């Protein structure tokens, strides 16, 4: 019943550092840091056991990577220093067993986007709607990514579709999530698509209804 | 250092057994621990110390390690099995991953719902005009998406995404944004996205013309 539960998408500016947080929700062995640049694949920043106070890190960092933690909060930290638009990746953290080399538990993983350029959050627009509709939201305009997308606060998982987002020529993200739900449902139901842009602190919530 | 060699991509009809190898320089003198990354998800460990499996995890899936080559291997292969297969070792104290090789899923032709939808009252205040053709559940992603304004073709002016494999069908969807000025959104009615696709017997269209309701 143990959650690795990690902190928030980042935009940070080159030159800079970052320090990301793995709290061992249940619990509390090996904590490890592996990232992931957007369609790449698992890359090991290193290892950390806090019980034996030893880390060990990856070559190919040039010594900027530390694994710290702190046993009275059960919360483990990657700090990376001198970042570079290359260090842009999902940032996740790992826990195993001692001595056993393998990872049985994931924590969510953490965008950290390194970018020169300012946050912008995104505008919401609704795609208003045989027997079978489609509806959706087009959330436009964002920087950096990620952006999530639910539909009735969750209650809503069936027939839905949230699009890969894709880069605009103005340097800005634009994706589309879509459902298709009976037509008969159309004037009964509500449809709402919950819009959520941690970097720049947004929430928005959007009636996808027929028009007048 | 120490280098685990995998094919990026294996592809195998439903039911049938999926084999994922991991290459390296005596292979099986390590223990070999496979992860199932499925997409937008966080790694899942699927195989540890070569052919053990941890509780959640289907007996379909089994590992295997001897000489040069690791293998991992999937039977009855369901559509919930489509993801990354990552396999990792431990080398000169350093943990080593392969690439990884993504899982397709061999399904039959299936020809998409198209949907097209005007841009919202809402955007056009901003300034300018989003027009979305929706392409639902096809198969293969393979898909000829045209934009017509007034009869005119249109190019240059549209950008596309694609959704990954889904999980209970296998199927593709796609999305065509058509991006246009209020100004030459509001000097054109007739607003059309024709469909090309394996799947169709004749390109399909959808259409509205903008004022309607």
């Known amino acids: 019943q143990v959650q690795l539960v990690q902190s928030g998408a980042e935009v940070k500016k080159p030159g800079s550092s970052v320090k990301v947080s793995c709290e061992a929700s249940?619990?509390?062995?090996?904590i490890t840091w592996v990232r992931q640049a957007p369609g790449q694949g698992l890359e090991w920043m290193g290892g950390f056991i806090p019980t034996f106070r030893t880390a060990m890190y990856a070559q190919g960092f040039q010594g900027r990577v530390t694994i710290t933690a702190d046993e009275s909060t059960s919360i483990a930290y990657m700090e990376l220093t001198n970042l570079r638009s290359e260090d842009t990746a999902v940032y996740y953290c790992?826990?195993?067993?001692?001595?056993?080399?393998?990872?049985?538990?994931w924590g969510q993983g953490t965008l950290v986007t390194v970018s020169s350029a300012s946050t912008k959050g995104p505008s919401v627009f609704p795609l208003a709607p045989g027997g079978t509709a489609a509806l959706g939201c087009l959330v436009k305009d964002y920087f950096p990514e990620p952006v999530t997308v639910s539909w009735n606060s969750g209650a809503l998982t069936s027939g839905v579709h949230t699009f890969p987002a894709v880069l605009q020529s103005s340097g800005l993200y634009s994706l589309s999530s879509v459902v298709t739900v009976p037509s008969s449902s159309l004037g009964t139901q509500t449809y709402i698509c919950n819009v959520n842009h941690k970097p720049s602190n947004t929430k928005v919530d959007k009636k996808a209804e027929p028009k007048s | 250092s120490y280098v685990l060699t995998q094919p990026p991509s294996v592809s195998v009809a439903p039911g049938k057994t999926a084999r994922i190898t991991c290459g390296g320089n005596?292979?099986?003198?390590?223990?070999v621990h496979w992860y199932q990354q499925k997409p937008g998800q966080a790694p899942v460990l699927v195989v540890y110390?070569?052919?053990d499996r941890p509780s959640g995890i289907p007996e379909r899936f089994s590992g295997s390690n001897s000489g040069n080559t690791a293998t991992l291997t999937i039977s009855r292969v369901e559509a919930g099995d489509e993801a990354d297969y990552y396999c990792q070792v431990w080398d000169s104290s350093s943990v080593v991953f392969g690439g990884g090789t993504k899982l397709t899923v061999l399904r039959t032709v299936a020809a998409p719902s198209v949907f097209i939808f005007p841009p919202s009252d809402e955007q056009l205040k901003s300034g300018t005009a989003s027009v979305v053709c929706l392409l639902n559940n096809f198969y293969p992603r393979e898909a000829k998406v045209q934009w017509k304004v007034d009869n005119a073709l249109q190019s240059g002016n549209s950008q596309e995404s694609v959704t990954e494999q889904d999980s209970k069908d296998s199927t593709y969807s796609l999305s065509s944004t058509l991006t246009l000025s209020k100004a030459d959104y509001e000097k054109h009615k007739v607003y059309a996205c024709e469909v090309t696709h394996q799947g169709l017997s004749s390109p399909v269209t959808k259409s509205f013309n903008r004022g309607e309701c």
């Open positions: 110390d070569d052919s």
């Open positions: 249940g619990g509390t062995y090996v």
């Open positions: 790992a826990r195993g067993p001692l001595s056993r080399g393998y990872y049985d538990y």
């Open positions: 005596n292979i099986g003198s390590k223990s």
